[PDB]
Structure 1
Amino acid sequence: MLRISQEALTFDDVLLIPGYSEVLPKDVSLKTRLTRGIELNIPLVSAAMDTVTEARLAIAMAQEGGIGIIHKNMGIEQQAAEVRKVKKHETAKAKTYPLASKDEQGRLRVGAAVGTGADTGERVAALVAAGVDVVVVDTAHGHSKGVIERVRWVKQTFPDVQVIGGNIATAEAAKALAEAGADAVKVGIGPGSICTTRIVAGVGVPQISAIANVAAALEGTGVPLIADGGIRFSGDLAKAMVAGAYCVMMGSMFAGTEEAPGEIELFQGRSYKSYRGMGSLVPEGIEGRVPYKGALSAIVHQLMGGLRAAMGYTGSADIQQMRTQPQFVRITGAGMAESHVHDVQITKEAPNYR
């Protein structure tokens, strides 16, 4: 009697099956795309949130081979100034970043978020003049007249900039944004760590199924999809890629880095940095904090180490193979309990595990 379209799965519902391997984890390729026009050397994007990405973290993300999306919870002039900081940043003396995401002019790549409200035309124009590489039309519900028409307008008005539209969670939404001319789509309704959309509105799609449905819809187009939200462990990243993601966007994972906005807060013997939803104070997110994690480079190293391991296990030599060839098994709650550490009292944990 219920109108149920499908059962939908998320990360903890599935595991990757090992396959025959001849390429070691250290030798696989991690190169992928953010959009039709923008390549990334590693499949990582930092979230457009005011506790995650401003110039400092965006510089670091690009240096690592990913990219940062500067948040829009600031004045237009201020957001453009952040973009300019990234574009003008020069590599120091003796430091070298062989994987750095750079444009044709050799400048670090950066993105920036806009909405669909009254200041959007001016905001986009300012960001484009500041040299932004990609404009992210970023709302809670990308499958809407407002977002579709704004994506079209950016493509027409500023023909040399890349455009991402989101967020979405269905095949029909993916086709609608592709029809608007999006250079990539961003996938995720509700899975974010600090997000309460699924609880307050009762709306969303478990992220592994969301990713796969969007990936299938975009087959034949060459338009990338960005899997946004819900990543807690490096293994989730691997699963997202095999479900069809071209890259992943994370907020919580990066909010605790030195390069993220904010200062270290001490509490009960541990160190933290603040992390809050952008729809937080009828709110659809809350406010919190995450453990301090040190330099971004160390978090990236752990994440990519885990992804490289997964590619080693599945026998995937590069991202295109990882996206299209490995298989999942579906598991139960007991399968997941067995996956975690179990029946031993931990005394010393790992940087990549709790």
Structure 2
Amino acid sequence: AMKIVKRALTFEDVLLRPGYSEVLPKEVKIHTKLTKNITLNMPLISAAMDTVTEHRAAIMMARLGGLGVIHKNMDIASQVREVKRVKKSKEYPDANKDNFGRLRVGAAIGVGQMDRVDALVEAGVDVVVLDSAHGHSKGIIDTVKAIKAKYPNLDLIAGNIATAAAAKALCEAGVDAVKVGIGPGSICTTRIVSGVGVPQISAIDECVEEANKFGVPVIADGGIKYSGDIAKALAVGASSVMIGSLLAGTDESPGELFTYQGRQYKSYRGMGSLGAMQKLVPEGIEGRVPYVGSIRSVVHQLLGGLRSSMGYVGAKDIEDFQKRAEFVEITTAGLKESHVHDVTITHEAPNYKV
């Protein structure tokens, strides 16, 4: 009776196979494309979350080569102000800038918020990010058309989706990039609360093969725990990666440092948690992540993982990485061997914890 279409695997089910290599990790190029008209010098985007990205985080992401998306849990006026501070802000040679030398910045919108879009455009946002829980819906697709009718030349990302049929529908409505991720987020409970989702490695795979038909890049959003997950998302064919938890414990994220039982924390929470929505049925939780320092130093570790990986595969840039990469499927016992095992860590590494 039940129709089961696929056995689906996430990040910790696969490994990249090494290949012949004449590249060194320090020599590879990691520039990529955010949208079909905007490129990144580095493939990372901080997530559109009121405990991750605001102007200070967005400034550093762009200075470092990526992008930050200003969350929408604020009044239009404040979000316009946050955009204007990124755009009116060297030692940052790889900085991502628009045609006039100003740093690039993205902002989030929701369905039926044209007024917000009019104000964000006047402030000069580079890309607007149209977030829903369910991207493959009449409300989202109708909003993509309304925005494209009024602002044909504004870059518009739509999400989130997890199927080839969803990618085709958002691409046909004329978006400039698709965000993939139903359920994988650290703070997300959608898959438990509603039963719905597609494990991320399979979701990216399905959506990349469909979107490539339209020349539309795919943003892998959610479920990154380690730098190797970035390498794998990019290698499957995604063009960039959105990070929440890994950036939430930085200096630049909103919220202050606190210490609890001898460890330092910042708070981090789902945009569909009770606290962020202040009866309601949430699909996120509120919690804490360990303080990790500046964004620059987290980013440096993350890209060092990416560069290391592309060295092992022998790829000179991201699309060579994508054409060269072959994976293997691993077992639970395989995962445990990959991690640290049979040794007690006494000096924690800056890129591998607990």
TM-score computed with the length of structure 1 as normaliser:
0.97
Mapped to 2, the partners of 1:323 and 1:271 lie a distance apart of 38
Describe the SS at the equivalent of 2:207.
helix
Flag structure 2 segments of 5+ consecutive residues without an equivalent.
275-280
Mapped to 2, the partners of 1:323 and 1:121 lie a distance apart of 37
Q: Which amino acid aligns with 2:162?
A: A
Q: Is 1:227 matched up with 2:220? A: yes
Cα deviation digits, residues 134-187 of structure 1 (max 9, x gap): 011111100001111111111121223100000000101001000111000000
Which residue of the partner structure matches residue 249 of structure 2? 256
Mapped to 1, the partners of 2:123 and 2:212 lie a distance apart of 33
Mapped to 1, the partners of 2:213 and 2:164 lie a distance apart of 13
Describe the SS at the equivalent of 1:34.
strand
Describe the SS at the equivalent of 1:98.
coil
RMSD: 0.8
- Aligned pairs for 1:207-218 (under 5 A) are 207-218=200-211
Q: Which amino acid aligns with 1:206?
A: P
1:148 aligned residue (121, 125, 141): 141
Mapped to 2, the partners of 1:209 and 1:271 lie a distance apart of 35
Mapped to 1, the partners of 2:152 and 2:98 lie a distance apart of 16
Mapped to 1, the partners of 2:291 and 2:273 lie a distance apart of 21
Q: Is 1:69 matched up with 2:69? A: yes
1:346 positional shift? 1.3
Which residue of the partner structure matches residue 6 of structure 1? 6
Mapped to 1, the partners of 2:147 and 2:257 lie a distance apart of 38
- Aligned pairs for 1:130-145 (under 5 A) are 130-145=123-138
Q: Which amino acid aligns with 1:293?
A: V
- Aligned pairs for 1:1-354 (under 5 A) are 1-89=1-89, 96-117=91-112, 120-281=113-274, 282-354=281-353
Q: Which amino acid aligns with 1:46?
A: S
Mapped to 1, the partners of 2:223 and 2:213 lie a distance apart of 27
Mapped to 2, the partners of 1:88 and 1:131 lie a distance apart of 11
Mapped to 2, the partners of 1:85 and 1:152 lie a distance apart of 29
1:190 positional shift? 0.4
1:323 positional shift? 2.0
Mapped to 2, the partners of 1:185 and 1:86 lie a distance apart of 24
Cα deviation digits, residues 299-345 of structure 1 (max 9, x gap): 00000000000000011110011123211100000000000000011
Mapped to 1, the partners of 2:344 and 2:225 lie a distance apart of 22
Mapped to 1, the partners of 2:321 and 2:110 lie a distance apart of 33
Mapped to 1, the partners of 2:295 and 2:346 lie a distance apart of 26
Describe the SS at the equivalent of 1:166.
strand
Mapped to 1, the partners of 2:269 and 2:344 lie a distance apart of 32
Q: Is the 8 A contact 1:51 1:274 kept in 2?
A: yes
Which residue of the partner structure matches residue 277 of structure 2? none
Q: Is the 8 A contact 1:256 1:292 kept in 2?
A: yes
Cα deviation digits, residues 65-117 of structure 1 (max 9, x gap): 0000000000011111100111111xxxxx52111110011110000000114
Describe the SS at the equivalent of 2:321.
helix
Q: Is the 8 A contact 1:246 1:323 kept in 2?
A: no
1:222 positional shift? 1.6
Mapped to 2, the partners of 1:241 and 1:96 lie a distance apart of 27
Q: Which amino acid aligns with 1:79?
A: Q
Describe the SS at the equivalent of 1:219.
helix
Q: Which amino acid aligns with 1:176?
A: A
Cα deviation digits, residues 264-317 of structure 1 (max 9, x gap): 010111111110000000000000010001110000000000000000001111
Q: Which amino acid aligns with 1:110?
A: V
Mapped to 2, the partners of 1:45 and 1:27 lie a distance apart of 22
Q: Which amino acid aligns with 1:61?
A: M
TM-score computed with the length of structure 2 as normaliser:
0.97
1:220 positional shift? 2.9
Q: Which amino acid aligns with 1:313?
A: Y
Mapped to 2, the partners of 1:73 and 1:6 lie a distance apart of 36
Mapped to 1, the partners of 2:14 and 2:2 lie a distance apart of 26
Q: Which amino acid aligns with 2:111?
A: T
1:11 positional shift? 0.4
Describe the SS at the equivalent of 2:56.
helix
Identical-pair percentage: 65
Describe the SS at the equivalent of 2:111.
coil
Question: Structure 1 runs of 4+ off > 2 angstroms?
Answer: none
Aligned residues between the structures: 347
Cα deviation digits, residues 186-218 of structure 1 (max 9, x gap): 000000000000000010000000000001001
Q: Which amino acid aligns with 1:3?
A: K
Moved more, 46-55 or 95-104: 95-104
Describe the SS at the equivalent of 1:248.
strand
Moved more, 156-165 or 223-232: 156-165
